[PDB]
């Protein structure tokens, strides 16, 4: 009961800068330049791990200790998201409220780290990130809540195999909730200069880049593994594993490509994300 | 306070510790495949600034060699100094120097940054950028062509070697 | 033997009160006597509560010093347990609090408040419930700083007993009995009646601090002492919640509109309190609005339970009640943590405004860690104790979302959406509070002069934080203990959450990037913390840091209509005698009259 979640967390950690690298090379190719390689994010992260972390005199243990906390919280997230089966490796932790409030832990620690430094830019970025979390958390909660009451249980691996076997009788509540979750993922992976990491340096900046890449992995993974499960397993076997890894990495790659495309193709989607979420909620109530 | 001075109070270039300066070659071979460069524009004309920003343009690219421009000195491994050190600009340039994590690489860009250029003996400048901070690589020109900027960064990262010598 | 335990506890509370008042000519010895007596009395109270909760039956008897009729239901045992814990740790805090040259000897009012609160919890008559809750409320009014702050609270408190006295008279006329077991066995024949229940709920929410009747709460929590304010927020609120719960569960009968009304009332309480806490720069007034929002969350759980007992859904009743009462106990714990720690910060510095209170995390690091635990416990973060009760309340919301009722299915997911709003706003508010108080450079010369916290203050706050962490990780072992009071199966919708595995997965996961940076480092110099923040070349100034004024601007940007609704529904100018010269002193003048005439008729 230990090996599968641990290997899940380790692989999802070690594949995260592929998704950042493919996103930045996609943004480079979209702006008609050759751009860096897909492994450039690994080179940047390892090189920053080589460098030594500096900070202000007023900064204490929070400034140094935040990036490890955010990486560990993203790991505790990623160990309960199903990427190859329809069953989560840890069904005890794989709830809906648990994942949301662990993301709240990540937001809280990022905000207090931004406020720990005396820089106005980091505190401003902390406030904007906390605003983003306030506006995105109930959208995604209502999306997976509509999907959960379609399913019957407040639990990942129940919503996933409910949408795996499409019932064809409550299809409109499923589709509207799916599009609301897509909008919430679009808001979280994007906005919807100086930056909020202008005081981080060295190993701390490297572990922040680790955490940012892992957060961008797990948000898209919570979308495409919970709501796109056709290609996974009901029970874990040792022969159909390669197909599951192939379809998982293909899903993640096409997800970051299309999100980069529609990000460069740009409170409309903020209201429409709420609007498609309530259109899902009314759909069960009317029907 | 920020920088060392003489008995008269005139600023002198900083002296890094040799413990700090001992691992510059290891830092160079570490950042050979990925260099984080922060432009520190001082008292200079835009020529020596727009051409540095044109190193990531369509004609000449820097991310293909690994060079990425950073928004903060804390992210910087290479501190690119541009203009002649104006008296009002010595303190912010020094602050950008101490904000970066040790060890650092400093590249002087342009005639005005190397020695002051046409303003070398003037009351409001301190001369070149080597009069306030140590400089590892000197890039001449007024303005330096993007080929010269790529050659300077490649020679700083060890991809190329120095061509001209003293006569 | 819980009757004898609670008898000895009330005896020690009243003995501590009379001995602190008798030895009031000095501060240190009076504070010592009051704190020791309150600690041992709270130990007896918590022992009686734990005995009743472990027995899971319910005991009755007679307190042989008032001639007081007593019943201790297992539902009230949780109130006794949380009162014992909070009273013990606030008394141990008061031991070191009464060594200051600025504070007052409050031990008489503290001990009388705790004795009245315990006698109100263990009361069997509803009239005696009102009388003892009314003794506690007047002692709390005396426990405020000056006569200005205890004026609106006095007006609302006497409005509440007018309402509760009318409701008690109506109950005595209709039933001929004021007892509670007799009313429960008589409410099979005649149901409660909206006219009595709504009146009692309004009268208890005037005591329990229910929005829009919340105007007394931040004014009372403006400049009161931390031993006063901690047991304010953890006792005065919970007594009104207990009265609401014992009026709502007075029979198996309970119309559907009661639960929907409680759900909407606690919902707007949670939302408005969590939003209004963000826009304040006083820590002890911010904690008052966070009291309001967590009382709204507990009322959401209780309203889910009342809706379940209306719809005859035992899983809904079980989920709503234990979620509400577990969040009640956990909220009292970490609210005591927050109030006592903020009082320690004021004790070592002298300031209560977080704008002029930076850099305290390095001066007192033990207190800083304790407030980090408390803030992460209040803003519901796993695996701490504020997350488990919210999880059970969300499970009750999901059970509401699947029950067959248009008034419940429409209200099901909306409560989830707004509770996500409230949780995110609380996370923001505590991020702001920890950022502008315990982090960054200090903004006043009075801040760096603050030395470490005292001995017993730190002991009390660390023990409270230890209890918070224990109640957080051991939620799967303490929730079936609370299943002995609300007595039936807990049925999350096919899902459990396990706090110990999250606890193990939040200390072991951050070790992996630590191992990776320990491996991937080469010539890495030791980390230095020397300079100032990078502010784009120019030097750093005190006017350039972003604080609570500038951190709470986009919530004023996006939630502007509610914050302007704060100014609209303010009928303060409509009262004729409100602007009187001596109205504040007149209210405290009849307060001495009222407490002196109502205590003696009980004795
Ligand atoms: S080197 Fe030439 S172009 Fe550059 S700042 Fe100096 S004078 Fe201007």
Author numbering:
A (entry chain D): 2 to 193, 205 to 278, 287 to 307
B (entry chain G): 4 to 170
C (entry chain C): 2 to 604
Quote the authors verbatim:
The prototypical hydrogen-producing enzyme, the membrane-bound formate hydrogenlyase (FHL) complex from Escherichia coli, links formate oxidation at a molybdopterin-containing formate dehydrogenase to proton reduction at a [NiFe] hydrogenase. As the pH of the growth medium drops, formate re-enters the cell and synthesis of the formate-hydrogen lyase (FHL) complex is induced. An electron relay containing eight [4Fe4S] clusters, coordinated by FdhF (A1), HycB (B1-B4), HycF (F1, F2) and HycG (G1), leads from the molybdopterin site to a [NiFe] hydrogenase active site in HycE.
The structure of aerobically isolated FHL, determined to 3.4 Å resolution (focused refinements 3.0–3.4 Å) by cryo-EM single-particle analysis provided important detail on the organization of the heptameric complex. However, the map density for the hydrogenase [NiFe] active site and proximal iron-sulfur cluster G1 was weak and poorly resolved, which we attribute to oxidative damage. The size exclusion chromatography (SEC) elution profile of the aerobically isolated complex shows two major peaks, the slower-eluting of which corresponds to a soluble complex lacking the membrane-associated subunits HycC and HycD. Arg122 of HycF, which is near to the ion, exhibits two alternate conformations in the aerobically isolated structure: one facing toward the ion and the other toward the acidic patch of FdhF. In the map obtained from aerobically prepared sample only weak density was observed for the ND1 and β1-β2 loops. We suggest that oxidative damage to the [NiFe] site causes disorder in this region, leading to the partial dissociation of the membrane arm observed by SEC. Our data suggest that FdhF is more strongly associated with the Hyc subunits under oxidizing than under reducing conditions.
